[PDB]
């Protein structure tokens with residue numbers, strides 16, 4: 376499995392400094408909504424200049440099909456390696472995004488957000504009238520059949536997803552606490568293809584040391 | 594009275610800025626979408642504001658975990674936009690966190706919730722929500738209203754029903770209006786739209802300013 380670090384430090388300067396501390400490590404970096412809204416595409420260029428990190432631009436697009444297609448096209452021009460969209464955008468949005476990205480010589484991987492990991496059962500049901508597990512399988516099938524590369528999901532749902540789609544349908548599991556439970560052992564047993572780790576790395580006294588340990592443990 | 598918002602959806606930034614210039618001094622709102630913001634960022638909002646004192650609706654439809662949506666709404670609110678929108682499907686906690694964060698501003702923008710994207714047909718929508726569109730819209734409108742939002746982005750055909758289920762003071766913004774086409778001005782007036790968004794009929798017209806003036810004249 377691959378390690379992705381969530382670049383969630385409060386300022387651009389801190390995130391770049393962290394990126395510099397993780398040079399030459401075989402890892403991915405995830406850039407979120409707040410960061411992109413504030414610094415734009417120029418921040419992505421600066422990161423690429425620090426090192427050849429594979430970049431997951433995490434914006435969770437959710438709009439009408441043509442708009443999502445235009446959005447995915449716009450960020451793909453930046454050379455990012457992975458992007459995500461809401462499966463809840465529906466089958467037509469998914470089809471239009473993949474049809475648009477097929478125009479690139481090299482496109483990024485495209486994963487669908489199933490159920491936001493922040494939801495609890497009651498609040499999720501109020502919106503989707505489905506249990507979290509039910510929705511995730513439902514969404515994963517729609518995403519798999521319509522051409523996406525995988526899903527963003529809880530480490531606890533990763534095996535179920537693959538069983539209802541394919542062992543080759545990718546799973547990215549965020550919020551992993553490597554040595555914490557959603558730990559590295561749970562990610563391994565549940566077949567996560569990608570793990571995203573945040574605070575355990577960025578708030579640690581020696582971020583590089585933590586990444587080193589995770590990779591070796593992997 | 595009903596407010597007119599023009600969708601700045603021309604393909605390039607030069608075209609969009611030129612359109613804004615053509616509409617200078619008209620009492621209208623301008624809507625900036627996802628592709629435009631991803632491509633040009635905050636500087637584009639700054640440049641639009643230099644054209645005239647237009648009220649701006651930054652339409653990004655945020656949908657992420659609560660703290661991330663709070664952070665996003667905060668960042669765009671610092672630009673001085675006048676209205677933003679978020680997905681009601683993000684849930685009540687996300688709605689509460691966004692409003693708690695925005696109460697920290699001396700002047701926050703209006704915050705509307707997207708209910709059911711107008712692009713959906715019944716079958717594809719049901720596949721995701723397991724509720725008919727109208728049912729979902731009412732359900733989402735209640736959650737939005739009870740948790741502090743200013744109103745909803747909705748089909749002009751659901752505007753009156755949304756207010757009946759929340760309150761007449763809960764705002765409705767109805768996009769895709771074809772003023773003289775049906776979702777036309779008459780329908781928007783009868784269904785009590787607080788804001789209408791018009792795209793192609795204005796930006797693809799040979800004389801966009803003349804179309805805006807004709808719309809404003811019929812509204813008033």
Ligand SMILES: [Cl-]
Pocket residue numbers: 559560561563
């Ligand atoms: Cl292990």
Ligand SMILES: [Cl-]
Pocket residue numbers: 497498499501502684685686736
């Ligand atoms: Cl909820």
